[PDB]
């Protein structure tokens, strides 16, 4: 018998924390409607009264209304849904005092699941932004149409960043292989003012094109090894884990 715990503003609003191995003692008074609230997204499956006639039941989605329709209506309500099955011990109150206007549920496991995920996301963002112990390469040269040149260019061993001035059109950057052929490389545009193009590869030679102008970028300290990606993310402090299982 979990007895609904009354609120601080009114006695008519009582809260109960769910417990699968316990029941709900609902003290209904005569001539009121008790509003039981399910969890959001919970799909009602089936219910079963002790007397189908003692209480009047009408349900709309996750909203439950019951109403006594007889004297000495002491029965039970076992409403079962896809997620769980509720248990009520409907004990009629004879003096019509201390009513129960709505029964609200608290789910401990769901709250723990939601707070664990939020804390994990906070830790993930903190670890992504902390960006500790990275090594930067600044030995980059350029030759070509200098009017489309970046004002800076470097890499951290995983991505290559080209920083452009505020007035310069952002050009298109192409990956150049040993024979001189060019191929697309994926890029993400980062920076406070979107002035940095981050390409997802470290390469010795690059190609920058804007219209009919071309600039060649040369990595003068190419590291054929680099640092391995053991975690699955762009940071050494955030692991990518398999959720789907299956």
């Amino acid at each position: 018998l979990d007895v609904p715990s009354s609120s601080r503003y009114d006695h008519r609003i009582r809260y109960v924390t769910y417990n699968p191995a316990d029941v709900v003692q609902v003290d209904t008074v005569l001539g009121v409607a008790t509003h039981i609230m399910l969890e959001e997204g919970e799909q009602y499956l089936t219910h079963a009264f002790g007397d189908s006639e003692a209480y009047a039941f009408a349900r709309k989605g996750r909203h439950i209304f019951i109403k006594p329709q007889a004297e000495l209506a002491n029965t039970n309500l076992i409403v079962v849904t896809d997620r769980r099955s509720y248990k009520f011990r409907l004990q009629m109150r004879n003096d019509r005092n201390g009513a129960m206007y709505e029964l609200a549920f608290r789910y401990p496991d769901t709250q723990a699941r939601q707070t664990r995920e939020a804390n994990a996301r906070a830790a993930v963002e903190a670890a992504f932004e902390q960006r500790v112990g990275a090594y930067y390469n600044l030995k980059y040269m350029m030759s070509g149409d200098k009017d489309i040149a970046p004002v800076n260019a470097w890499d951290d061993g995983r991505f290559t960043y080209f920083k452009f001035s505020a007035n310069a059109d952002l050009p298109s950057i192409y990956f150049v292989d040993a024979e001189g052929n060019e191929s697309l490389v994926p890029r993400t545009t980062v920076g406070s003012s979107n002035n940095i193009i981050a390409v997802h590869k470290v390469n010795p030679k690059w190609m920058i094109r804007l219209g009919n102008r071309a600039l060649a970028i040369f990595n003068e300290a190419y590291d054929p090894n680099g640092v391995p990606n053991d975690t699955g993310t762009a940071s050494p402090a955030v692991r990518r884990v398999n959720k789907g299982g299956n």
Binding site: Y140, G144, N152, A153, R209, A214, L215
Partner: peptide
């Protein structure tokens, strides 16, 4: 006889550093 023109190739002469000054995104 006729083939699709290649884009401009940059002149390999004026090779100068991209980084005149250390960026601030490197915290320097």
């Amino acid at each position: 006889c006729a083939s699709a023109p290649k884009p401009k190739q940059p002149s390999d002469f004026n090779r100068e550093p991209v980084n005149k000054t250390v960026p601030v995104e490197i915290q320097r």
